[PDB]
Amino acid sequence: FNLDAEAPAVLSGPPGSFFGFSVEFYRPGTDGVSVLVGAPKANTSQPGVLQGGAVYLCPWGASPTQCTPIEFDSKGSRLLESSLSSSEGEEPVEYKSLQWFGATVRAHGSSILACAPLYSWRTEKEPLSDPVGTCYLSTDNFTRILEYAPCRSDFSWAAGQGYCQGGFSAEFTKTGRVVLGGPGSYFWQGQILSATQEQIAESYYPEYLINLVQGQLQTRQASSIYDDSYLGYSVAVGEFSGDDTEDFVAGVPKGNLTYGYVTILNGSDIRSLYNFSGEQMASYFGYAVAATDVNGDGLDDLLVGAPLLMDRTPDGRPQEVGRVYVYLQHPAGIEPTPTLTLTGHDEFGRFGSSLTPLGDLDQDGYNDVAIGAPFGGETQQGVVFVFPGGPGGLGSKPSQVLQPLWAASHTPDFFGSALRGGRDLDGNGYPDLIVGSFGVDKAVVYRGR
């Protein structure tokens, strides 16, 4: 329909680097508009670091669209002071190798946020391998790069935040606040964790590895019965309480004895506001979440995805086709039951793996939504669907379907695994879309017409 599927732009990174695992827009609607692409397994030029991850900057407008890597950090793994002081010599405190840095790239204005979920660091007290989360926050066009590792705290073990794996999912609120989700905190209970950029910069002090941010907001620890809930597997932001501050949306895929549920946390607090339980057990309810107005009422509406949901064809044979649930918001409040459900049509397609608002892509007054099926298509290469909005919510039939142009190969292409949209690159007033294909280390950019 609208998106120029005839000939999109293709950005390719180093082979085997998982280029395109995460995508984002940078400085849209202004000079210097660019596309950020993460390569979690890209070899970097850091001292003694192997596959430390990288984030690429791809300027828009240039005909070749050459992509270059950003030098967020060029310092190898640190060393323990006692090790070099005592009869040890070398004993790194941190383990930056294979840290999967750049697995989550988010930007808001002049700020960028690249996280390394698998960062682990030997505790200075006793030997350990706690894989806490560490994130870097570029500010003012790379003028001052900070580091945000909130889960790297005194409580250091699986019983605490040692296995937090913070930065597994990140987001920026409209006011620049940073929201993080640590799935592995408190014996994999999970944890939402946020702080404003001003607080991060004010308390920055790189001498101490354990740095505490003042005024930080985080979810408290719960009883042992809530273990292995994976709260924070995916996060999103939207206005759901009638306040002026965007409210947090977090996914808990393995909560409620593996049925799963999604929770909305109040702004200015971290209190829970709404719960949305899953439908089928092991339907991985909460792979992705989003919040956008899909009926032009001016109120945000929640979307959820369950890629592993199993449905049976009318013949009787069961099949694995994903699902997506849409909850519409009303002046009274959101309802606990879905207002609409969308189901896949291909086996092992993982429909609903990724979701992303597209904005008023059609300029018809109703926002649109894009849903990805990493293993869909007629050759298991991956497919992306576009579902138009309307007065009654999302339309049950996709308006457009996007597929890769390159021929299939022996490795899965993971096309549509990561998506982003809602910003205009060419500046013609029509939103755009970026789709990740890290299976072959490629990212494609689509533009309205």
Next chain:
Amino acid sequence: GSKDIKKNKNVTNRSLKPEDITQIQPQQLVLRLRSGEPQTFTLKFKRAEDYPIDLYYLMDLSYSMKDDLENVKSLGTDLMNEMRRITSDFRIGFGSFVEKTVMPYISTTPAKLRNPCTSEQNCTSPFSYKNVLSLTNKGEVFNELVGKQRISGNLDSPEGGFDAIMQVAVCGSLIGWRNVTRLLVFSTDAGFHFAGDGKLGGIVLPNDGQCHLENNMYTMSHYYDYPSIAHLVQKLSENNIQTIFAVTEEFQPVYKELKNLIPKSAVGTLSANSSNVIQLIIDAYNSLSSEVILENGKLSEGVTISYKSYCKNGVNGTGENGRKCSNISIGDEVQFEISITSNKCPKKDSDSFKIRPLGFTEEVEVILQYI
């Protein structure tokens, strides 16, 4: 339309070889569909007197289940002694699973990489899945091998046994599966890892469902993600494997729902240090073998099927239950009413599909002839 029965070999009567025993009366027939008008036929099922059994014991060897491993050193001979009353042919096997060997699930420090448990306990390094003993008819070897197994340790409460189930089901000849009643016992006392949890370890490739066993050890545990329940159901159904869940009382509801999802499987309540595994297995087998589920394979487009059940004791079920006949005992005849509908004239002159009871290699061949 019309119909005609081609082979229709008489089902074995009351009281040889697993392939010489018949349990479906009609075998092959041709249905000449006439578009709107459907065609119907009936097939008799009769449970065989004694049918060989192949049991594969898959046990969880995390630090939890430590006491259980101490009360299983006599299972090999006890189960065979308690099983001879049911069948004259029996074979048993053993297998163990702990977890994927990657960072978030297992501590990677060398001290914890060699001795995952505390220094007081002398544990072994973690492993994904090990095939201790292929199916065999001697219980002494089972006892001897299971006696010397060593417990392991891990970090997170849920254990990654689903990939072990996949490797057991798909490896076939390596596990020694036969064309008889295949039973799988899944003993654990914690939740399970399914697809999507491997992302925390940097694993994104979906499980491909292939035998990746090298020297009775499952490599590639770091390469492929955990298998989804849909994949497990598909592979178990394809391989005709009936699963028994012997899990503790704490995690009963999770496995009750799992057995609801999976077809032809039962869930037991393991107690104490595996005190009553034998009785649990026998009860589960008796419950499973007293039911029949009929399924069809890839019915052609434009063709719809209907099942009817003529059970015992005068209860005649219909609807989705028409393919299910419960409470069947040894040598108790049962009949099904099957009708095929074809609401078009597909270009395929004659396409055939097979109706097969779950867990059996016996198939009835149905050949369609449109117009």
Next chain:
Amino acid sequence: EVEVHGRGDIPRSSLELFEKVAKELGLKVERNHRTVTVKGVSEEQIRELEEVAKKLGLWVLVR
């Protein structure tokens, strides 16, 4: 006071042994789902309980 957890991949059997030793030690035990907390534990009592928990592989705390 002492609050052992034993909530990871730890046997259920080696979690009521701590409760039995604490109760037979004259202290008070506040049972919980895969978590035990005691009250009125002295310095010697706390040291002994911590040593026992460490030997059992539990995660001992203090309050």
